Each structure stands twice: as C-alpha cells, then as structure tokens.
Amino acid sequence: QNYGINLPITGSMDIATSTLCLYYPTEAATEINDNSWKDTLSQLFLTKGWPTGSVYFKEYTNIASFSVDPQLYCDYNVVLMKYDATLQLDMSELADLILNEWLCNPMDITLYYYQQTDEANKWISMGSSCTIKVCPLNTQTLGIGCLTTDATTFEEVATAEKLVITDVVDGVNHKLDVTTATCTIRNCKKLGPRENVAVIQVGGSDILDITADPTTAPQTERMMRINWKKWWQVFYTVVDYVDQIIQVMSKRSRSLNSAAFYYRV
Amino acid sequence: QNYGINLPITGSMDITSTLCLYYPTEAATEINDNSWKDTLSQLFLTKGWPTGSVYFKEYTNIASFSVDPQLYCDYNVVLMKYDATLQLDMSELADLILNEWLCNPMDITLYYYQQTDEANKWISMGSSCTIKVCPLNTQTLGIGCLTTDATTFEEVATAEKLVITDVVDGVNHKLDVTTATCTIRNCKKLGPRENVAVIQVGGSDILDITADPTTAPQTERMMRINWKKWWQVFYTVVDYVDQIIQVMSKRSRSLNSAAFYYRV
Amino acid sequence: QNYGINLPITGSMDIAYALTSTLCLYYPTEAATEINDNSWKDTLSQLFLTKGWPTGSVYFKEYTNIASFSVDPQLYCDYNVVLMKYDATLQLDMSELADLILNEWLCNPMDITLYYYQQTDEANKWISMGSSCTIKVCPLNTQTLGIGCLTTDATTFEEVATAEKLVITDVVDGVNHKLDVTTATCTIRNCKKLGPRENVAVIQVGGSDILDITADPTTAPQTERMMRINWKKWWQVFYTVVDYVDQIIQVMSKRSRSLNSAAFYYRV
Amino acid sequence: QNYGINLPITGSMDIAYATSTLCLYYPTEAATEINDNSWKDTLSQLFLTKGWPTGSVYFKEYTNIASFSVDPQLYCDYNVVLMKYDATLQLDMSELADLILNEWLCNPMDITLYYYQQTDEANKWISMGSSCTIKVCPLNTQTLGIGCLTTDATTFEEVATAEKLVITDVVDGVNHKLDVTTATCTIRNCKKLGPRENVAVIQVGGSDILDITADPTTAPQTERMMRINWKKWWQVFYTVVDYVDQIIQVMSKRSRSLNSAAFYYRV
Amino acid sequence: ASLIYRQLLTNSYTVDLSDEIQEIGSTKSQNVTINPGPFAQTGYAPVN
C-alpha cells in the first residue's frame, strides 16, 4: 500500500541486473574513423569485470540538439560534453535538467496566465526553436512596460533556443507569448536530485552551475573535470576507473518511462 | 519520508482529478459537430467533475495511436474500434497499455541477445518493423540459418506499427532489424498497470493481454459494449463515469511510494 | 391469507425436507422454410409426451423476421424458450431484445410535446418501439437552455437512433432533455428495471456469444438462462433442446410474479 | 418465497398511532368544445398546486366510448376516466365499468376446437374487438342442441350484435357452442378476481346507472363511483382538479399492474 | 472575546446585497450564439 513510508525504521550499531551507457559527440566518432570501436570498448569492459550485454552507445549531432527532450537509455548513464567559451549556458542548463528529477504540467499561453509560488517552481522550455516573451502584470491586471493588447513590446528572454530555463519573480502573474508551433513550455517543480546520471566535462575549468541561486552555485560529488587531447585517451581513462564512478553513483533511481522529466497533466 | 526500503505494515482489524479520453476520428466524422466536447464537459460538470479538468485528444487510427502510446493522465479511458483483421494490434496494444513495462534499448549489430525468464518480451515500434531472428546453437553455429545470411531468417513481423515479439528463452539469438523505421527495446514486465481502462465497442472480448497459452485472464478493465451511433456510446460513458472511476484507483507509481522503486 | 406485507419466514435444518407445465417456443421462419416439412410439430409433441409433458397445451408461434419479432413481443406462457439467430452485423438487436425479455420493466407513457424529462436512478432507461423510430434529443442544463443544440429548432438535435424497430436508450442523470420524435408511428415509454425475470430464457442459435444485460459498461455478466449452441440444421437444434428439456426446466422456474400469492407487487 | 402467507402479524389497540403519476382520460368532444391549443400545460400548472411535480400528468383522447372500450390501457398508478352518459348505451357503460373496475384473469379459449362452460357462479365470457356478434347454443348430455341445431349455426340464440364490448353471463353445469366471429373479435373465458382500487369513474350526465356485477339482486354502488353535472367541460375539469385529494384517498396505488392490458392472460 | 468570530459567521448574509451593489454599477455583456460544427462545401457552377 503505502510501503510503510510513515512507519519509523530502526537498525543497530552491532551488525557487521546492471547496464551501462555512454553519450558522446559525433566529432569523436569522426576522429576515431573506425566502425569497430564499439566492439573494442565492449570487450574491454568485459575484461575489466563488467559482463558483456550491458554496454550500449548513443550519439548526437550537437550539444543543443541533444537537449531536445533529452532521454535516458540505461540504469547507469555517463555523459561527456565538450567545453567551449560560448555554449556555457546550454551545458549548465542541460546538466541541471538531466541531473535531477522534475514534475511538470502542460501550459497554455492563450487562455490563462501563470505564476510561481516557491523557489523550486520553474518553467522549462524545450523544442527546436523557442521564442519566449513574458510581460509582468500587477494586482489590477494592467500593463507594466508592455501592452497586453499588443504582442510586439514584451521582454526578450529567448531567441531560437533549444533549451532555456526561465524564472520570474516568484509569486506574481505573467502573460507569456511564444510560437507554440515548434516549442512548448512546462511548469515544473524540482522534487529532488537524481542519482542515475553523472556529467563529466572535458575541456577547461568547472563551470556547470545547477542552481539559479546566486549565493549558492556549488559543485556536486558527481560532476567530473578531465583534460583531453584525444578521445581514445579519455575512453581508456573512463574504463580504467569505472568502479569509482559506479560507487559514487547509484542504481536506485531508474526511471520506468525513460524520460528525463516527468510530465503529469 | 522514508523510501527505498520496505517495512512491515501493521494495523488493527477493529476500528477531483484529471481524466483523459480518446476516440477515433471516424466518430467525429459520424457526429458532425464541433461543440460536442464542450457539451460533454458540461455534462461531466453536472455529474461531478469540475469544469476545466477533462481533456480530449484525437487520433486517426489504431496504428497511429500505437507509436509512442504513452498515457500521462491520472485516469485514462480509451475507446477502441473493433476491426476484423487487427486482432493482434488490439491485443498487443492493450497488453502494452495495461502492464508496467521496464525497457532497455538494444543495439542490433553489436550484441547477441537472449531472455532471462518467462516475464520478458521484446516491445517494438516504428513506421514499419521487419524483425528477423536466428537462434544460434551453444557453439556459435547457425541452426537452419547462417550468421552472415540475410535471407534465410525466420520472418516473424512485417509492416507492423506495434509488434510484441517473444522468443524461446535459454539460448542466444541474432537480431537484424532496420533501425531507420523501427526500434526494438528489451522490456521486462513488472506487474499490472491499473491507470488505464479500455472500453471496446463491438467485438467479443478477444483481447488477450498475456501470450501464455494455458492462461487467458479477462482483467476487469476490458469493458465491452455494442454501438450503432457514437452519441449513444458517449452518453453511456458520461452517465456511468462513477462505475469506471470506481474500477480504477490512484496510479501505483505517481504516489510518492514507488519512488526509488522504478518511479513512474 | 395476508397479501402485500413482507413478513419473516420461520425455518429449520433438522427437519427432513430433501408435470402440469405449459411450454412455448419462438423460432424464425427460415427454420420452417429449411426443414421442408410441416408435420414436424406432431413429432415434437410426441417427443415431449415421451419425456413426460402432456400435449395439447403446447403452443408454437412464428415471426417473419427478428425485426418483426422485435416490435411489441407477446409473452403469455409458463416457460418461454426463444431461438434467436446470431449475426456479426446485428448485435444490438439481439442485445436489446434479450435485455427487454429478460427483466421486468414497469413503464409509464411519455409525452414529449408538453414536458421535459430527466433520470433519477440507474434503472431508468428509455424504450422506443414502433415501425419508424428516430429519437432526437437535445440536452438542457439547469438553466433550461440548449447546449450544442438550440431549443427553438429540432433538426440540429443529436440523434441516438434512425428508423430503428426498437431502441433502448439511456441519458445522463441530473439534466433535462428536450425530445422531438414523430409520434404518429412510434411510442416512447419511461421504464424502470424493477428486477430479474426468470419466465423467459433465450438460446443464441449461432456463434460468438456477445449478449450484455446491464446498462453499465463495468459489468457484462453471462447469465445461466442465456444458452448458446452451434447449428447447421434446425432438426439437430430441436433434438438437443428436447433431450436437455429437464435441464432447461430446472434452470428456469415459474414466473416470480404469478404465483397466486404475490399479489399487489406490480402483478396479479 | 411465499410472501408471508403463513405467519399472521400482530398489532395493538390501546397504543397511540393516530413518481406517483396520475392519468386523465376524456372524450374528444371535450377536446373540441374547450377550443384551447395549450390547455394541457395550463392544467399541469394547476395540478402543480396540489403537490404533483411536473411530469406526472397525462391527457389522452378517445373518439367514442364504445370504441375506447376496445383494448383498455392502464397508464398510471392512479386512473380516473371521464365517461359521458348516453340515453341508450347503458349496457356498454356497465360492461366498461365492470371490465375496468375489477381485476380479471382469463384463460385461452378456441370454440372451433373445444367446448367450454362456466366453472362457478362468478366467471363470465369477455370479448373485445371492432365487431363482436356472439351466439350461444346449449347442448344436452348427448351433445344435442335445445332450441338450436348442431349442424346449422344460424338458429343460435343471439346475445351479441353490433357491439364493441361483450360481457355474456352463462348458466353452469351445461356445455355450450359459440358461432363467434373468429376474425374481427377475440374471446376469452375469464374468472373474476376481486375489487381493484386502481381506477375510478367520473360520470358527466346521467342518473347513476352502473351495475358493476352480473348479480341481478345486488346492484351495489361502491364508494369509487361518482356523478357530477356538466354543461361546459372547463367546469368539469376545474371540479376534478378541485377535489383531487378525495379521489386520491378513495383510491390506492398498491394495485398497479405490469402489462398494458387491464387483465392478465395466463395460458 | 470569542464574539468576533461568532458575529462574523452569524451576520454574514447581508454581504449578498454587496454583490448587487457591484452588479448594479457594472456593465454586463451578452453575445449571440455562433454557428458550430463544420460547414458544407459549395462552389460555383462549371463555367464556359
């Protein structure tokens, strides 16, 4: 029934299947220029100690394109993202979305308004092209810096973005204008952290921020930073220390519907 | 509070949510109206569902509804038109939508797959699936079909939007499915999914939600009525919504009790 | 003795406790055309005599078509067994006929020219019988106005039938419904399902059994009075019926409304 | 089971103890004399005052009393029929009153294949249809007619002719032969059951002529028979609606039937 | 000092009149019914 979630547990101070996934850019695949590296990695994982039949692969055309409703495909996910001086925000937001869980609702921006009433209520935008425009409203439902009867004088927050997390002043109403033909926006609540996917950044210094709070932008015990020159060295290093990554992660947060975010109407 | 661990439950013997509906486009063409959704919403308001809480989504065919048929709705009722040749389609669609499925994607040209127990099947979907299987021996030698032969395989499914394939467990097999129009994932059945109820118009209660020959349980969530006009069916559904909602309960995974137990 | 008052009945378990019938059959005319004989009724009477029931009191009636039998059935008998031909295109006809002949309906007339109507129970169903019935209905909310159809007109109604010989209809409880039907040929009655009727049993002479007897989609049980057998020749069906006449008599019983003691309970 | 026919109940003496439709039947003569298109809704509104909710009042027309006597239909838990006296149709009124007032359980009969006779001093013959001309010929012990011939059916004693409803009383202990019209009439042997309190008769005009029983000596006038004077049908309707309480008290809805006909048919 | 809640609960019917006060001053709006459903397709006649 309720699994005894309200019944206190008690221990003592006297008592003394699995799957693996890898996510890589197609640039590495072109650099390797081989059609059997999958076999090599599979056999190396088999020899290291992880039984064969539990290692798969997946590729994306670009970092932003992979963010179009990202999915999960294993009970263990190790994702590698290339570093750049321009795609910092996309990497950070994608890591924030795929590092935790979410509970979203469908939203309509032509028949009602919306508001956020906590520090964990955010709006998630995903699609091939999102153009979000938001106009704040006061108590008497008037226009402040933008006209309700018009739709060309709002405040810009997105421009041809494939993934953007928007936050407004929590506790006030808004009117949203967006081309819903190709992109949708969902009101979500961050229930808690997810312990099934670990993000490893290759390139420069650690820059991934998972908290919109300025005062606290911490680094978790799962985001890794390794320098790289050739992708084969990175693959060998990851295979070499697989047990540590397995231990720091967990297998008790598998999603049954294989979706990075839950979508309840 | 506490999750992840089951604890003994003890007790004493002595002492308004969303609902989605689905329908064929043929019904809408046979009704010839556009405010009908609003009328049924008002009738639900009279029956005890607050206005602004009942949704309606429209598909064109059972095959179209079969690709990515994920129902995300606290209480789901599905109307299915009974055909004369789509018995497999209806049966496997009901089986997929009635059981909680945990799936692992499979690369089709890198590994050789098998099955663990009798509660394991292969769920496949796509525009067109042409699945071929060749059971190898224990010594990597083909039996009636060669590993590098693409013509002698035993055909099992062709041009099917939704196909559930089961093979004999205990020995490996080779798979060759076109991963441009189809995708096959290793799925394991956990238990009954009680958030979906299906009302079948026409037919004779043939949908078998289990491939086992010996057993053929008729789960109560497969209702059967006969139709001539769609307004009659909609009126019957709306009038007796209480019985349908009493048949179903809260989803076993939406509540914060299956969290960290393959949640949702 | 006292009638019309439900009283406790005394009983016991240590006391050691453990014909004159009138049979009737209804069959379609295609059986009579196929058998190519007209003296078969004498053979059936003799066979019934062999089993033990007296002759002379057994009556037989024919109906031209299942639609002809559908309109205004006549049932004045003691053990009704009806043979209904099965089809894969006319399921609703068999369902409605068996439902009507299986349960007692206390009905009142309906005047849809000077009144409105609404339901108050789960046994409230609307039965239309006639030669050309086309029920046209427009729901009215609590404010007595049309939703999805204008009360002023009648062609814009959402129909539930079209020239049906018989149609059983149910409407959403708690709301009014304005009706417009051509009363010159068809009649609509408001009936309530009081209880089961054991005086009539239906044998589905055909294939896939599809009968439902309940208006709610949640439950579609298979009652014992509903018999079903395969068929290629009607003489085989008659032989099977006469051989198992004892089982049919045991599963059925005398009508629960004409026991000569259940008076003032809506019958006798 | 047997519905409490073995255990009598007990009460007390010194202790202190101190959807329901109604049908209306009226001839078409009133429908032509009133000259009102929407009179039915007004009558329903008037009946609303006396506690009847809307949806329980009906209005049915019949062309002629004798024609209406063919296949009577009971449509409510309370039936009141407005019948107009005629100076030369007393027997038809008496037959209709007898047929509607008391319950009837009839047995099937076919004179062309069998002979029939009354079993007691309380069972008669009832025939209904468009035209019913019935002739009776007694037969002696050796099956020979007295006053009529077995071979010829024209010399029989005529008892019915040019009638819509025929209620014939016959002697007991002797067989009979009937040359009935087996096409435009239906004849059933019936046994009288008892007093039914589901109907009442309101007579406009006449001088209280209703013999509800075949007994010549006892011609009772039960409390459910009422007479009022008429010159305009609106006055009659107002009188009926002005005393619905009394006619409700004189009736009871626990005598309602199931079948459309006012008489059961157990074959 | 419990009388505040009891008087709030008891003498709370006259507030109904307040509705009228807002209803009298305000301006309402009624609209005719829109023709629903699909529309029949009908073009011209063949031309020469």
Q: Do the bridges between strand B120-135 and strand B154-165 make them parallel or antiparallel, or are there none, so unpaired?
A: antiparallel
Judged by a CB distance cut-off of 8 A, whether residue A265 touches chain B is yes
Nearest to D160 by CA among D234, D91, D242: D91
Residue C39 and residue C203: Cα distance in Å, rounded?
24
Question: From B32, which residue of chain E is nearest by alpha-carbon distance?
Answer: E37
Q: How far is CA A76 from CA A47, A79, D2, E29, in A?
A: 19, 10, 73, 60
CB contact under 8 A, B72 and A9: no
Query: Which residue is listed with tokens 């009635």?
Result: B98
Q: At residue B207, what is the residue type?
A: L
**Cα-flanking dihedrals φ and ψ of residue B37, to 5°?**
-60, -45
**If residue A106 lies in a helix (H) or strand (E), which one and from where to where?**
strand A103-106
Query: In Å, what is the CA distance from A119 to each residue of A108, A188, A191, B226, C225?
Result: 22, 11, 12, 52, 65
CA atoms of B4 and A9, how far apart (whole Å) = 12
- Answer for the pair C108, C190: CB distance below 8 angstroms, yes or no: yes
Contacts B54 to A, Cβ<8 Å: none
Of the candidates D3, D75, D266, which has its C-beta nearest C76's C-beta? D266
8 Å CB contact of D2 and C9: yes
Our CA dihedral for D38, D39, D45, D51, rounded to 10 degrees, sits at -140
Q: How many CB atoms lie within 10 A of CB E32?
A: 5
CA atoms of C257 and C195, how far apart (whole Å): 11
Task: Taking the CA atoms of C29, C34, C40 and C44 in sequence, report the sign of the dihedral they define.
Answer: negative
Q: What residues 8-47 of chain A have any CB closer than 8 A to a CB of chain B? A: 8-9, 17, 19, 38-39, 42
Contacts of B39 in chain C (CB under 8 A): 139, 147-148
Nearest to residue D69, comparing CAs of D24, D129, D29, D134? D129
Contact C218 B42 (CB under 8 A): no
Q: Can you tell me the distance from the alpha carbon of A61 to that of A66, in angstroms, rounded to the nearest whole number?
A: 7
Nearest to C201 by CA among C92, C77, C89: C77
Burial string for C239-261 (b: 16+ CB within 10 Å, else e) reads eebeeebeebbeebeebebbbee
Inter-chain contact C148–B38, Cβ cutoff 8 Å? yes
CB B19 within 8 A of CB B49: yes
Chain C residue with Cα closest to D76: C108
- Number of Cβ within 10 Å of residue B3's Cβ equals 15
Nearest CA-CA partner of D21 in B82, C107, B147, C135: C107
Residues 6 or more apart whose Cβ sits within 8 Å of residue B203: B82, B90, B224
- Classify residue E2 by its DSSP letter: T
Residues on chain D touching C5 (C-beta within 8 angstroms):
4, 9
Residues 6+ apart with CB under 8 A from C137: C157, C158, C159, C160, C171, C177, C178, C179
Yes or no, beta carbons of C268 and D264 under 8 Å apart: yes
Residue C88 is encoded by which pair of tokens? 């894969």
The angle that helices D39-48 and D233-242 make with each other, rounded to 10 degrees, is: 20
CB contacts < 8 A, C to D, total 73
- Interchain CB contact of B117 with A (< 8 Å): no
CA-nearest residue to C177 within chain B is B43
Measured between CB atoms, which of C95, C141, C174 is closest to B226?
C95
The phi, psi pair for C128, rounded to 5°, reads -115, 125
Consult the annotation and say whether D221 binds a ligand.
no
Identity of residue A65: S
Q: Which residue has the tokens 């076919």?
A: D110
Rounded to a whole number, what is the distance in Å from the CA of C161 to chain B's nearest CA?
Answer: 7
Distance CA(B155)–CA(A101), nearest Å, equals 41
Closest by CA to C223, choosing from C96, C67, C103, is C103
Please state the φ and ψ torsions of residue C71, each to the nearest 5 degrees.
Answer: -80, 120
Q: Which residues neighbour B111 within 8 Å (Cβ) at sequence distance 6 or greater?
A: A42, A52, A53
The DSSP element (H or E) to which C200 belongs, if any, is: strand C200-205
CA distances from A181 to A127, A130, A131, A184, A231 (A): 10, 9, 11, 8, 39
The DSSP letter of residue D191 is E
- The tokens of A63 are what? 């970092």
Distance between CA atoms of residues C148 and C158, nearest Å: 9
Q: Chain D residues with CB inside 8 Å of C117's CB?
A: 55
- Best probe of the C interface among B44, B200, B205, B235, by most C CBs < 10 A, is B235
* Contact at CB, D40 and C114, closer than 8 angstroms: yes
Top residue of B111, B179, B186, B256 to mutate, by most chain A CBs within 10 Å, is B111
C50 φ, ψ to 5°? -60, -40
Nearest-Cα distance to chain B for C160, in Å, is 6
CA–CA separation, D8 and C8 (whole Å): 10
Please name the residue ranges forming H helices in C36-183: 40-51, 66-70, 91-102
Round to whole Å and give the CA distance between D59 and D46.
Answer: 14
If DSSP codes are grouped into helix, strand and coil, which group holds residue C210? Answer: coil
**Which residues on B lie below 8 Å from A73 (Cβ)?**
104-105
Find out whether B155 is annotated in a ligand binding site: no
User: CA of C168 to nearest chain B CA: how many angstroms apart?
Assistant: 10
Task: Determine phi and psi for D146, rounding to 5 degrees.
Answer: -115, 115
Q: How was this structure obtained? A: cryo-EM
Cβ–Cβ contact C171 with B under 8 A: yes
| Rounded-to-integer distance, Cα C155 and Cα C40, Å | 52
Distance CA C215, CA C19 (A): 37
Resolution (A): 4.7
User: Is C119 labelled a binding residue?
Assistant: yes
